[PDB]
Design an enzyme around this catalytic site. Structure first.
Site, mmCIF file in Angstrom:
data_model
loop_
_atom_site.group_PDB
_atom_site.id
_atom_site.type_symbol
_atom_site.label_atom_id
_atom_site.label_comp_id
_atom_site.label_asym_id
_atom_site.label_seq_id
_atom_site.Cartn_x
_atom_site.Cartn_y
_atom_site.Cartn_z
ATOM 1 N N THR A 41 0.825 -1.200 0.000
ATOM 2 C CA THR A 41 0.000 0.000 0.000
ATOM 3 C C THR A 41 0.861 1.253 0.000
ATOM 4 O OG1 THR A 41 -1.727 1.231 1.178
ATOM 5 C CG2 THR A 41 -0.145 -0.005 2.511
ATOM 6 N N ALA A 79 -6.278 -2.583 7.811
ATOM 7 C CA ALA A 79 -7.341 -1.977 7.025
ATOM 8 C C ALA A 79 -8.599 -1.795 7.858
ATOM 9 C CB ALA A 79 -7.628 -2.835 5.796
#
Lengths: 212, 213, 245, 198, 232, 199, 236, 73
Positions: F1, F49
């Protein structure tokens, strides 16, 4: 004492303009034993929403019971059946509620949204909550999702007309992908249950799948 | 129950067209030190439900306590309702699930057999909480070697008469005595039918050791 | 009024608790309930009053089953009756779970009596305004009957009656060789007792509740089967006619 | 620790070793593994000393209170059931096994066994302790259904004598106790009058 | 007579009345009047202020307070209680959005505020007297515009047009006369202002009245000074 | 990410890829890592997340209540502090959220970086994620307090493109948001295949 | 009285506890509700009052789990509280056991819950007379409970202001019950409500509320125009 | 019954229910209830009495008034 034993699962979901499909193998196999050849892993939460759960089967049942009890709670306290988005948000909260002993239940919700198109949400046990177009989860996700990348989004492909994915082709996609998954994944097999969701309702279609 | 102190062994179950027939050895094990041998591992939950565990017999006795107390309370109410096999199965599944979530597992593995409203029920509430209904059940280490016979017999011949289903369970318990270090050639084959629940005492398979010689 | 009767935590200036006495007075206004001890069982009857015809046969049921083998027969305020029945149920369950064998009736009566004693002691809770009887039979201990009133006394009784007509019920029960009768005949005699104490002109409608627990059923308390109830009612009508003669 | 119990119609005879080694070395030369619970009910203790004593004293309290409250003599079933509830609840905390025997009116002459766990079961003969294994064969080898009081006495003497003679964890005065209506008769086989089997 | 039955919320009277509850209902009367209307084009709220004298800014006599982007709330009654119930409403609306990711319907919101107003003296929660406030929640849920009135006794109901406060009995009649279903929000504003003018003492003049509207579109809009002048 | 957010006088850019990696398996290329906490704030996602998503959702709830209660705005600092305090109460229990909270307030622009390890830090420009170490050098050499809006957009876009090309767990889209006094807007969203030919 | 009717903790010196009688009276202040059953159904018809021709009508039939409807006549607060408790009990039973809760047992739980606050000085009696419908495996029921914490299994009952009219009508016309039709049973309920009316007024699509349960029919409520097939077919 | 003998009371009336509603009522008040119910029937343009009229007479004999309280179902 291990409080999780991976009981094996393969769920898939396809969105669309009008139809929402949620397919799942029916093999409830623990460790090295296929000790139930019939165990649908897709539950009809409402008339517009179907949930597919993979993983530890006790937690799958518990999460399903909690979700359905919460649907009844919402209906009594709001006099209206939950929408697909509402159920997705609620399930996010339910899963994260126990964030320090997680549910071992990979979830794929599929249903018609307010406008009327197919909407599919994918989860991770802790509670991550994504709205995808088509998603596979469980054990054979790695081998079911990529082919849908090839044939539903046309990734690595060009000079291709993005014709709307019709219901007939969607059903063919699901059948072929799950046949291949049964061929090359042991927790797959023991029959396939496909849920097709549209204005009529949650039509259920089941196909005989390699029993080995 | 973290450590398993004194454990049982396998427990089988098949669906007679007019009844559910379950089988359990009366063996009592302690890690290859077979203790109490005339211990009844099958309980008559009510007129239309029977239970058999294969894990820690002490936890089986606690669950006997709770289930018996609950059914007595139901009858006391005497409103006429009864605990369906599905109802007992769900109660037992939630009991084991809660005991697991508390990280205090019920180290049992229970077949719930019953006959209700022209239907036959047979469920597999396990330690962690895995629960389900299947046409033929085999629980414990003997599951691996016992389910094959029952599954193939049903798949090539779905409906099973009472006599042939019985004979099949004695054959299965025979193979168990042959291939289960913690078995004993003395078992109870309880059967529930539209009449009731019958625990037909200490049977014994005709182990033909001469068959192999 | 009196100025010492409010609350049950205050002795009146004689040694009297007017709250318990009012509880007993409320007890002595409900339909009659008789129980008789035989040589091999105990039989209960209750003078159930159908306050309206809309109610199914099977309305408020004043014969409750406490534990597999104890019958509780209640006269008074039936909400309190159900509460006491649940208390006794839980106590029988606890005794079985904690000791392993079926609750002795003397002990169950003692514990429920102490419970009602607790609710007569305090100022934040009113004493139970409903009296009841506990009866059972066991191959070992034998047929037993007991009464528990608001004050919480568990005197043993061969036979007893509670409610509007208790003096009449007693007076008529002494007219019985209870020591030697059997359940079958005592059922009919209970029917006669109920129908002699009943007042049709005053209570308008009426229905009969009966039960026995004895060796004849193996200690499993059971509502009198329909045929035996019908036969007992027939004999009761005949006995009423004979008394009218 | 080695303990045994057998039933003779009209009563029960209990037997125990008298060694209380704690990881070897020093012990209680002579011990009272057979503890009296109420009047006719005895408990044969096995395993951890402190846990066994605590459970025995607790059950003594509960059973004595229950006896006084019921005004009836206590059932061996109730005594052994109280032991079972205690052990099963404190399964992890408590490490011990106890054989509960004695006489009661309704079903006189009972011998239940409650090993580590809620394991609750009646038996005509019960064996327990570290030495249980070494006599767990010659307790069936010579179990004749219908032993008299004397017969069960020789049976227990022989069994526990072999247990102590073939187990280090048990050894010393073999304590036996036969309970019937007449009351508990306690005997001790000290050093030689124990059966010497070659 | 009512010397031992109306001094506690948990002591029934021979009639079967909760006299502390009727007394809270009376305490509602004392407040400044409010008039909420629900028509096909949204919901309107017009309330009277009781400015004692200048040096008391407009933003302290809160008769209208915004409940989420899709409801407005008109108060009638004790200010502390009004603040508590408005806070309950806001936290509930936002919690429902947080857990379900949707806008709480006005039925749900008034139901839950009522559920708070229920627990007078129940020993499972902590008040001891009814929340002496009568509220109007006028919002836009999926069933089109809706308006729900709450009384201090935990009873809430839909109202196609409702007035509350001191001018309650004197304005319900006017609302009864004037209201009709096929009404546009401009008509609603004018009619509510006319009824307010009828049942006020000071001359309605854009600084003795507040107005707001929640529409199936732009959010709860609190009319500003120039808009007040225009409407007046 | 990979995600980054930087202040450039005019406003604050918030650029981010889209890829969730499960061990050696990639769940989806359609992740949405920039978070609409409010029309006025934006929150970025890195690490856990679900932790990030849920905790910033609860931040959204509390900021909306605060805006109503004090009929005013919630400062970027006043919201970063709330998120930090909440995430700290459950310290070390496993939360693995790193995030950037960016917005315009009565004190002008404001950007803070709050993680599970109780680090509420003011800054000029930040980058988080497994590819932040890559995306940060390019961003440093190319960032300046004065930057035209389009050139800043291009800087962010190409920085994230290079992060995807070089680091593995950074793939996906090139989502890009603008934070201005009037609120936040969606500048562009083009996958990495397009950028591989644009560059 | 005047010193023995201040709480449920004090008996009067004649054997009656006054607060419970006061609550029994409170139940009468609601609206007419007539509930009834057949061999396969259970129907609850209640009179929804109007607080103004602008404000809508109070609901009086709530929907507990799919095999229980409930008609409430009494304090709206206590009606809501017991409705929430009944829903909780139904859902809890569904969670532990997978069987809809028998309506002869849910009532027992409610009775215990309502007796508990009639023997302690910490709360007031409840104030809702409850008609619980539902179709367990046995058959349809219509249970009545009053603040006194006594529950009755009624062949057909009614409660509320002007509830005698209904009860007498039930006396008169209940011989037909247990053999009527899916709609004829509702018609009988409507007639009961008609008799409860004050005359002049009638059963209008608004003030009429109907709820139905039974085999092959989970609980349903017919309001607004959903009730027209009943009033239109009702005999003048 | 005794004080209603000379009236036009409809058979539907439930005098036992009315007696239950009396609640420490003495006899003069019962007669007054009969009379009050009779004249409540006189009003409204009616030919007979009814249980509702008897209840209203009971209310007017205590001097109370039945109000549809807004916090009752």
């Amino acid at each position: 004492f291990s409080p999780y034993v991976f009981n094996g699962g393969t769920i898939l979901a396809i969105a669309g303009e009008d139809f929402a499909i949620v397919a799942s193998d029916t093999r409830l196999s623990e460790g090295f034993s296929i000790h139930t050849r019939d165990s649908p892993k897709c539950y009809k939460l409402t008339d517009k929403t179907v949930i597919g759960c993979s993983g530890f089967h006790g937690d799958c049942l518990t999460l399903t019971k909690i979700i359905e009890a919460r649907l009844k709670m919402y209906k009594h306290s709001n006099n209206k059946a939950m929408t697909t988005g509402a159920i997705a948000a609620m399930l996010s909260t339910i899963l994260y509620s126990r964030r320090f002993f997680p549910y071992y239940v990979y979830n794929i919700i599929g249903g018609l949204d307010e406008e009327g198109k197919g909407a599919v949400y994918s989860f991770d046990p802790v509670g991550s909550y994504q709205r995808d177009s088509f998603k596979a989860g469980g054990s054979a996700s790695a081998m079911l999702q990529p082919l849908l990348d090839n044939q539903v989004g046309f990734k690595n492909m060009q000079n291709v007309e993005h014709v709307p994915l019709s219901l007939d082709r969607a059903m063919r996609l699901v059948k072929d992908v799950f046949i291949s998954a049964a061929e090359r994944d042991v927790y797959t097999g023991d029959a396939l249950r496909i849920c097709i969701v549209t204005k009529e309702g949650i039509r259920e279609e089941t196909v005989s799948l390699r029993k080995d | 129950t973290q450590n398993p102190m004194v454990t049982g062994t396998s427990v089988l179950g098949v669906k007679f067209e007019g009844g559910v027939v379950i089988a359990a050895d009366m063996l009592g094990s302690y890690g290859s030190l077979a203790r109490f041998r005339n211990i009844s591992r099958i309980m008559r939950v009510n007129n239309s439900t029977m239970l058999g565990a294969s894990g820690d017999y002490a936890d089986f006795q606690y669950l006997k306590q709770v289930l018996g107390q609950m059914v007595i309370d139901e009858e006391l109410l005497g409103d006429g309702h009864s605990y369906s096999p599905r109802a007992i199965h769900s109660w037992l599944t939630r009991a084991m699930y809660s005991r697991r979530s508390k990280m205090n597992p019920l180290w049992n593995t229970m077949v719930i057999g019953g006959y209700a409203d022209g239907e036959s029920f047979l469920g597999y509430v396990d330690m962690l909480g895995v629960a389900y209904e299947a046409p033929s059940l085999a629980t414990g280490y003997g599951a691996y070697l016992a389910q094959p016979l029952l599954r193939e017999v049903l798949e090539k011949q779905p409906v099973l008469s009472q006599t042939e289903a019985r004979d099949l369970v004695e054959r299965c318990m025979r193979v168990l005595y042959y291939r289960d270090a913690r078995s004993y050639n003395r078992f109870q084959i309880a059967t529930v039918t539209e009449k009731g629940v019958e625990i037909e005492g200490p049977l014994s398979t005709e182990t033909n050791w001469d068959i192999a010689h | 009024g009196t100025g010492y009767d409010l609350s049950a935590s205050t002795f009146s200036p004689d040694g009297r608790v007017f709250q318990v006495e009012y509880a007993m007075k409320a007890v002595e206004n409900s339909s009659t309930a008789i129980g008789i001890r035989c040589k091999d069982g105990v039989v209960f009857g209750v003078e159930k009053l159908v306050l309206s015809k809309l109610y199914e046969e099977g309305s408020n049921k004043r014969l409750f089953n406490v534990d597999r083998h104890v019958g509780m027969a209640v006269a008074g305020l039936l909400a309190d009756a159900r509460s006491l029945a649940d208390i006794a149920r839980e106590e029988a369950s606890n005794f079985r779970s904690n000791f392993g064998y079926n609750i002795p009736l003397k002990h169950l009566a003692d514990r429920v009596a102490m419970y009602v004693h607790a609710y007569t002691l305090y100022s934040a809770v009113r004493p139970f305004g409903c009296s009841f009887m506990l009866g059972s039979y066991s191959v070992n201990d034998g047929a037993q009957l007991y009464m528990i009133d608001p004050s919480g006394v568990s005197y043993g009784y061969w036979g007893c009656a509670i409610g509007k007509a208790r003096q009449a019920a007693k007076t008529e029960i002494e007219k019985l060789q209870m020591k030697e009768m059997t359940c079958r005949d005592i059922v009919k005699e209970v029917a006669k007792i109920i129908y002699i104490v009943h007042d049709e002109v005053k209570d308008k409608a009426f229905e009969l509740e009966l039960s026995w627990v004895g060796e004849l059923t193996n200690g499993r308390h059971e509502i009198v089967p329909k045929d035996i109830r019908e036969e007992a009612e027939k004999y009761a009508k005949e006995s009423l006619k004979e008394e009218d003669e | 620790t080695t303990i045994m119990a057998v039933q003779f119609d009209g009563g029960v005879v209990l037997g125990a070793d008298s060694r209380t080694t704690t990881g070897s070395y020093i012990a209680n030369r002579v011990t009272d593994k057979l503890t009296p619970i109420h009047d006719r009910i005895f408990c044969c203790r096995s395993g951890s000393a402190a846990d066994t004593q605590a459970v025995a004293d607790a059950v003594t309290y509960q059973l004595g209170f229950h006896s006084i409250e019921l005004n009836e003599p206590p059932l061996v079933h109730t005594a052994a059931s109280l032991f079972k509830e205690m052990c099963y609840r404190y399964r992890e905390d408590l490490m011990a096994g106890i054989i509960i025997a004695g006489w009661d009116p309704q079903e006189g002459g009972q011998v239940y066994s409650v090993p580590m766990g809620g394991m609750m079961v009646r038996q005509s003969f019960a064996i327990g302790g570290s030495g249980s294994s070494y006599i767990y064969g010659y307790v069936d080898a010579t179990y004749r259904e219908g032993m008299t009081k004397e017969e069960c006495l020789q049976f227990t003497a022989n069994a526990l004598a072999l247990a102590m003679e073939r187990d280090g964890s048990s050894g010393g005065v073999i304590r036996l106790a036969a309970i019937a209506e007449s009351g508990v008769e306690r005997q001790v086989l000290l050093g030689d009058q124990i059966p010497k089997f070659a | 007579t009512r010397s031992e039955y109306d001094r506690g919320v948990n002591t029934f009277s021979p009639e079967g009345r909760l006299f502390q509850v009727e007394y809270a209902i009376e305490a509602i009367k004392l407040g400044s009047t409010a008039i909420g209307i629900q028509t096909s084009e949204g919901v309107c709220l017009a309330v009277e202020k009781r400015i004692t004298s200048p040096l008391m800014e407009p933003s302290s006599i809160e008769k209208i307070v915004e409940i989420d982007a899709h409801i407005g709330c008109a108060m009638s009654g004790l200010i502390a209680d009004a603040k508590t119930l408005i806070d309950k409403a806001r936290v509930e609306t936002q919690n429902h959005w947080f857990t379900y990711n949707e806008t709480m319907t006005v039925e749900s919101v008034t139901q839950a505020v009522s559920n708070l107003a229920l627990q007078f003296g129940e020993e499972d929660a902590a008040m001891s007297r009814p929340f002496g406030v009568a509220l109007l929640f006028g919002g836009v849920d999926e069933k089109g515009p809706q308006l729900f009135h709450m009384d201090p006794s935990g009873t809430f109901v839909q109202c196609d047009a409702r007035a509350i406060g001191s001018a309650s009995e004197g304005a319900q009649s006017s609302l009864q006369e004037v209201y009709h279903k096929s009404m546009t929000l401009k008509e609603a504003i004018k009619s509510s202002l006319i009824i307010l003018k009828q049942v006020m003492e000071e001359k309605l003049n854009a600084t003795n009245i507040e107005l707001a509207t929640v529409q199936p579109g732009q959010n709860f809009h609190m009319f500003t000074k120039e808009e007040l002048e225009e409407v007046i | 990410t990979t995600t980054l957010a930087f202040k450039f006088r005019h406003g604050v850019i918030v650029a981010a890829d889209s890829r969730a990696t499960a061990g050696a398996y990639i769940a989806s290329q359609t992740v949405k890592k920039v978070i609409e906490i409010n029309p006025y704030l934006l929150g970025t996602m890195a690490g856990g997340a679900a932790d990030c998503s849920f905790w910033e959702r609860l931040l959204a709830r509390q900021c909306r209540i605060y805006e109503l209660r004090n009929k005013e705005r919630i400062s970027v600092a006043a919201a970063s502090k709330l998120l930090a305090n909440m995430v700290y109460q459950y310290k070390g229990m496993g939360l693995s959220m790193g995030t950037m909270i960016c917005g315009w307030d009565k004190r002008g622009p404001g950007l803070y970086y709050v993680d599970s390890e109780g680090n509420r830090i003011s800054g000029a420009t930040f980058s988080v994620g497994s590819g932040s170490v890559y995306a940060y050098g390019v961003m440093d050499r190319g960032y300046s307090y004065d930057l035209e809006v389009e050139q800043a957009y291009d800087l962010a876009r190409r920085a994230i493109y290079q992060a995807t090309y070089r680091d593995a767990y950074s793939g996906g889209a090139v989502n890009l948001y603008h934070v201005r006094e009037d609120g936040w807007i969606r500048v562009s969203s083009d996958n990495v295949a397009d950028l591989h030919e644009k560059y | 009285r005047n010193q023995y009717d201040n709480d449920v903790t004090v008996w009067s010196p004649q054997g009656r506890i006054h607060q419970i009688e006061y609550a029994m009276e409170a139940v009468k202040q609601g609206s007419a509700t007539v509930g009834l059953k057949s061999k396969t159904h259970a129907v609850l018809v209640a009179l929804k009052r109007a607080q103004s021709e602008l404000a809508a009508h109070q609901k009086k039939i709530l929907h507990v789990d799919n095999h229980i409807g409930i008609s409430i006549a009494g304090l709206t607060a206590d009606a809501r509280l017991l409705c929430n408790f009944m829903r909780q009990e139904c859902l809890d039973s569904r969670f532990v056991f997978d069987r809809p809760l028998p309506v002869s047992r849910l009532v027992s739980l409610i009775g215990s819950k309502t007796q508990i606050p009639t023997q302690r000085y910490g709360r007031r009696p409840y104030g809702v007379g409850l008609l619980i419908a539902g179709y367990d495996d046995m058959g349809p029921h219509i249970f009545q409970t009053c603040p006194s914490a006594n529950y009755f299994d009624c062949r057909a009952m009614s409660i509320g202001a002007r509830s005698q009219s209904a009860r007498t009508y039930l006396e008169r016309h209940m011989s037909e019950f247990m053999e009527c039709n899916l709609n004829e049973l509702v018609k009988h309920g409507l007639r009961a409500l008609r008799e409860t009316l004050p005359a002049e007024q009638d059963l209008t699509t608004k003030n009429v509320s109907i709820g139905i349960v039974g085999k092959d029919l989970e609980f349903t409520i017919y309001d607004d125009d959903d009730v027209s097939p009943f009033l239109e077919g009702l005999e003048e | 019954q005794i004080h209603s003998r000379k009236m036009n009371v409809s058979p539907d009336v439930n005098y036992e229910e009315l007696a239950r509603c009396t609640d420490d009522f003495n006899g003069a008040q019962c007669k007054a209830v009969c009379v009050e119910a009779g004249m409540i029937a006189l009003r409204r343009g009616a030919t007979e009495l009814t249980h509702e009229d008897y209840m209203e007479g009971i209310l007017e004999v205590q001097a109370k008034k039945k109000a549809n309280l807004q916090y009752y179902a």
